[PDB]
Design a binder for this molecule. Sequence first.
Ligand code: HEM
Ligand SMILES: [N]
Length: 184
Amino acid sequence: ACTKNAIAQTGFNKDKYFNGDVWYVTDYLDLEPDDVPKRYCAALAAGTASGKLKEALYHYDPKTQDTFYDVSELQVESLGKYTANFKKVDKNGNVKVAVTAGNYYTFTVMYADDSSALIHTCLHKGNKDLGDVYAVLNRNKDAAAGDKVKSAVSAATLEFSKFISTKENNCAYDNDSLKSLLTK
Ligand code: HEM
Ligand SMILES: [N]
């Protein structure tokens, strides 16, 4: 179960974050760890598509090769905090698993600038019991976390030393599919 009410960034700039471009997860912290494997790849695009706030997600387990994409139209709870009912799609946007009550994540942007971000997400999926996941994002898939985002991790009363890096997983991403999925 999730336990955190994450606080959104003061002065969060939604249009800059939701600009249609890709964010890569570089590091993550799962508060209920055996939620998820140690050795993971994830990325997202987020933007407005024909007036609708959207995210597209990609997950890849570099050991098992388990791969999935998702798309959601985000609903606003407050500036920088969203609820996202997702649908699993192939890379081209064809629906594999339709939107369904109880399949949603929340999404809080705790810090962002043009190149980096810190987010909190709480996943709900059927009768699974999942916990809080924090993620450090960068526009550059190879970037080491810099002082702005590491300071934001401390300001959330988290220790960056606990975050697990994605950098040694050979992650390769289809940026084109993430951008195009925003429309789907
Ligand atoms: C970047 C922010 C993230 C968001 C918004 C997010 C969102 C989601 C969503 C919506 C699903 C369900 C997809 C579906 O069934 O169609 C999912 C599943 C999953 N995510 Fe993430 N995720 C994020 C990052 C991560 C990270 C960093 C990991 C690290 C291992 C991770 C591990 C998983 C796993 C293992 C599942 C499968 C859960 C299951 O069905 O048992 N995710 N995530
Ligand atoms: N997740």
